[PDB]
Design a protein around this ligand. Structure first.
Ligand SMILES: [Mg+2]
Ligand SMILES: [Zn+2]
Lengths: 124, 80, 48, 357, 56, 145, 124
């Protein structure tokens, strides 16, 4: 079981080799693939803002503060991405690792801090 | 307990520059602050210094994963 | 049950060429559309 | 000439940056480049399917035989490994992932470290000593890696550090190349900075109808000797081509014995006119399945069905063909397709010889 | 004590990130675990002797 | 599952409605009948096809969830941002290379022929032909203005 | 995470030490007072074959091999003795009754298994 800092927890179900994972035009590939259907009902919007902000942090070379109740502006954070050479939405062109074919849609990919929960399958 | 030998995500060998990067980052942040006590320097203020061009000078590419793992990894020798 | 499985593989194999994502920019109102929400909210606080 | 215009660019340290220069000089007495550097290779292919280019990329990533450093059992000397934080699991994981460029498996190394000081001492890869095999004229790994750190008065002794062989598909310490670029040059693109097109890939054709045949592929190799970049890159490319040819020939040797009953090939006569073939190869991947399907489809444009499957929990590749011919004619077409694959990759290897000087 | 007139204080450049230093000061004085050791020090300094002598 | 590194009970996501389960850490029990009498009645009486219709409500229990709901919409959608929602013969054949049914016949199709998504779905629903006519969830009076 | 900095001096039950930890790219004020335990994983928010449905994730096998969320797990034991009745030592089957069936006594030296040997199910 893993989890992000917004309380979005899940079970590792599949592990793929390197040649089987999706990759972007610049070769970026994920460590984790989480389902977009985990978002709309749980409304964990701070996890998506963290991916937006941290994506520009990594290219800038900095660690910033995202404490609760500080002033935020998702419009101005999304313009920071464009200033760094990325798209406004933080989405990229991706390819299927198994066939080599590109999706007809840009994929939202970026860094999100995750945790391993101490619930081990070998013990249960 | 150290910066990993390779990037966790792609496998680029970021660990051949880890020692140089750590020392050079220390020197660079000290230059940017200008000789202040380690406790009188806030943790937040030193993390806002841009290390883009230092990492570029090490020869490490512009990959999101490699710079993330080179910049954020905690060092056990500085906590124990 | 055999049809649920078969139509589920058709749908999944279609999306492995089409893609489906969600981003932070999907939940963001346009600057002029933000002012329209504020006007609707002020009308409620005026009637209140 | 299937692939032209290669570009090779090593990743080098910029010593004009003062902070990097000072840190390097005072840590390793390093004023020049390191013995081994990463190399970025960008290749353009023309007149070829993306099944072939992507199969080449997949093999070069994690299906090519590669080498790593491992520890033989009992090599971690518990008796005189007084340090308690530098456990065997941690140090072994550190050592497995050092990139090496080794030319024989007879070499053996050792680590014999003592902390006879009052501070924490750092172990670097320059502290590995060769204890067996012929003496190295050139290094096989860089001397700048951090392997561990010892508390005051502690030691770490590891014997029997040998060179192991494998493929990155089984353990990722045998991975070779990292992806840096992939694109098709015969499909036009939108400007996707405009907020009108930023939800789309950028290509002007759907991937459900486009058939590109002009590609650009970029891969980075992690540790290559500085005076032999072209030779190392050439060797890697040739080995990838040879690996693919070998696996296709393994399938070929199954196809030809369609008279003798085989557990890997099944032929049905579904009707008076239609024949069905099912090929099940254990431990095969999407590389061969995709290549076989693409070339069978190019040979028989009017086929009833061709498709393959690699279910993750089955560890096998199953290829299904349904065609309106007799069994002998179907086998003839299949052999023709496999020959086309072999010919394409032989041309690729000959072009590699011509291009990289 | 008399405090200076409130109409001459410069706070227009106080930001919400400036206000987190108050939280920093509060935690630094208090400590994350402050009361648990103060209470035991009082028990070892003023509670046990008084409870042994003047109660039984 | 012959991979020795797997310790989980695995199932299809559309079977979770029978047990009211999901994949955030739930545990389920499993026992295998060894007796002949217990094995006969497991297969004839207690198979999960007998619980496809609810006893409580008398309606169906299983169906698509979340990826096949939105992936069936994307497949049968008439227009895509790229134009018409069509694929060529190779990609239409590829949609069926996993369904574990008998493949359809594409022999009356050329490599450059285009097939709509509704054409591909019909190749699957021909085996069990039914009649259906309603309006989708997609069409809403709320969104219409 | 690093559950304590004196783990090698302790004999604990069901404790996990995770080797590698990171500071979040978007940190908060709480990371001025506790050690962060987690990693800055790259996450793609997408549909990939239906294996991340209903709170599941797809993991990179390479990420696992490289030590992402890897660590060491500990279990302790405590067996006591009676005054002059019981003692520690390798049992002799001929003069000792009720030896546990199928149990491997060949690992014992001087009553305890030596440090560094792998114990299996059924071993003494
Ligand atoms: Mg649950
Ligand atoms: Zn990387």
């Amino acid at each position: 079981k893993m989890s992000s800092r917004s309380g979005n927890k899940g079970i590792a179900a599949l592990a793929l080799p390197t040649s089987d994972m999706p990759f972007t035009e610049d070769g970026l590939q994920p460590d984790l693939i989480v389902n977009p259907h985990s978002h709309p009902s749980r409304m964990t919007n701070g996890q998506m803002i963290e991916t937006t902000v941290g994506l520009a942090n990594a290219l800038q070379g900095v660690v910033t503060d995202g404490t609760a109740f500080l002033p935020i502006n998702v419009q101005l954070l999304s313009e920071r991405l464009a200033q760094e050479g990325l798209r406004f939405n933080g989405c990229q062109k991706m390819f299927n690792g198994q066939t080599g074919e590109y999706f007809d849609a840009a994929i939202f990919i970026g860094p999100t801090y995750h945790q391993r929960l101490q619930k081990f399958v070998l013990d249960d | 307990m150290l910066i990993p030998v390779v990037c966790f995500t792609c496998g680029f060998p970021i660990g051949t520059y880890a020692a140089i990067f750590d020392k050079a980052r220390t020197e660079y942040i000290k230059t940017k602050m200008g000789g202040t006590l380690p406790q009188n320097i806030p943790l937040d203020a030193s993390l806002q210094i841009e290390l883009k061009d230092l990492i570029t000078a090490l020869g490490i590419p512009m990959r999101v994963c490699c710079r993330t793992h080179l910049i954020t990894t905690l060092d056990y020798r500085k906590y124990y | 049950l055999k049809m649920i499985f078969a139509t589920q593989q058709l749908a999944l194999n279609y999306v492995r060429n089409a893609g489906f994502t969600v981003s932070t920019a999907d939940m963001l109102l346009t600057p002029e559309a933000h002012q329209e929400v504020q006007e609707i909210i002020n009308e409620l606080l005026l009637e209140s | 000439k299937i692939f032209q215009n290669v570009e090779i660019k090593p990743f080098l340290i910029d010593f004009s940056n003062l902070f990097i220069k000072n840190a390097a000089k005072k840590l390793f007495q390093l004023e020049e480049q390191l013995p081994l550097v990463p190399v970025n290779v960008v290749m353009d292919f023309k007149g070829i399917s993306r099944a072939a280019v992507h199969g080449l990329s997949r093999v070069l990533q994690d299906e090519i035989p590669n080498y790593m450093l491992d520890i033989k059992p009992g090599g971690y000397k518990i008796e005189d490994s007084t340090d308690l934080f530098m456990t065997e699991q941690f140090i072994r994981n550190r050592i497995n992932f050092i990139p090496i460029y080794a030319k024989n498996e007879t070499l053996v190394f050792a680590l014999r470290s003592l902390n006879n000081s009052c501070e924490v001492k750092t172990i670097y890869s320059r502290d590995l000593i060769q204890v067996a095999g012929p003496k190295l004229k050139y290094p096989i790994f860089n001397p700048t890696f951090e392997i561990g750190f010892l508390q005051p008065g502690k030691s770490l002794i590891i014997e029997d550090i040998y060179i192991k062989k494998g493929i990155g598909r089984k353990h990722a310490a045998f991975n070779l190349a990292v992806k840096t670029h992939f694109s098709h040059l015969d499909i036009e693109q939108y400007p996707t900075d405009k907020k009108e097109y930023m939800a789309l890939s950028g290509y002007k054709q759907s991937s459900m109808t486009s058939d590109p045949r002009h590609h650009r592929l970029g891969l980075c190799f992690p540790a290559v000797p500085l005076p032999h970049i072209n030779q190392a890159v050439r060797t890697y490319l040739k080995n990838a081509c040879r690996i693919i040819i070998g696996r296709i020939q393994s399938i070929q040797k199954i196809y030809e014995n369609f008279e003798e009953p085989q557990p890997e090939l099944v032929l049905f006569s579904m009707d008076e006119e239609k024949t069905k073939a099912i090929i099940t190869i254990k431990d095969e991947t999407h590389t061969i399945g995709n290549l076989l399907k693409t070339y069978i489809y190019e040979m028989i444009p009017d086929i009833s069905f061709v498709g393959y499957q690699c279910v993750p929990h089955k560890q096998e590749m199953v290829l299904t063909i349904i065609h309106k011919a007799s069994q002998e004619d179907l086998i003839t077409l299949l052999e023709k397709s496999i020959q086309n694959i072999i010919q394409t990759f032989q041309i690729l290897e000959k072009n590699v010889d011509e291009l990289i000087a | 004590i008399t405090y200076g007139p409130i109409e001459t204080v410069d706070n227009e450049e106080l930001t919400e990130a400036d206000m987190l230093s108050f939280i920093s000061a509060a935690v630094n004085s208090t400590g994350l675990i402050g009361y648990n050791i103060k209470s035991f020090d009082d028990l070892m300094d003023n509670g046990i002797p008084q409870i042994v002598k003047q109660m039984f | 599952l012959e991979n020795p590194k797997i310790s989980t009970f695995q199932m299809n996501v559309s079977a979770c409605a029978w047990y009211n389960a999901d994949f955030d850490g739930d545990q389920m029990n499993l026992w295998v009948p060894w007796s002949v009498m217990s094995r006969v009645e497991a297969e004839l009486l207690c198979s999960v096809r007998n619980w496809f219709i609810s006893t409580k409500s008398s309606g169906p229990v299983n169906g698509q969830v979340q990826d096949s709901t939105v992936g069936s919409f994307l497949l049968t959608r008439t227009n895509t941002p790229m134009g018409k929602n069509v694929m060529n013969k190779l990609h239409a054949m590829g949609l069926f290379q996993t369904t574990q049914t008998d493949p359809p016949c594409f022999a009356n199709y050329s490599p450059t022929d285009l097939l709509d998504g509704k054409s591909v779905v019909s190749m699957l629903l021909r085996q069990t032909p039914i009649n259906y006519q309603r309006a989708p969830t997609w069409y809403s009076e709320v969104y219409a203005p | 995470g690093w559950y304590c900095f004196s783990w090698p001096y302790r004999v604990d039950m069901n404790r996990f030490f995770q080797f590698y930890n990171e500071m979040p790219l978007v940190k908060t004020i709480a990371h001025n007072y506790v050690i962060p335990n987690g990693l800055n994983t790259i996450v793609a928010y997408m549909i990939y074959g239906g294996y991340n449905q209903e709170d599941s994730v797809i993991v990179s096998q390479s990420f696992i091999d490289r030590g992402g969320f890897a660590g060491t797990f500990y279990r302790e034991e405590k067996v006591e003795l009676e005054s002059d009745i019981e003692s520690f030592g390798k049992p002799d089957p001929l003069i000792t009754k009720n030896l546990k069936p199928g149990a491997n006594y060949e690992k014992l030296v001087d009553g305890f298994v030596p440090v560094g040997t792998v114990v299996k199910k059924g071993d003494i």
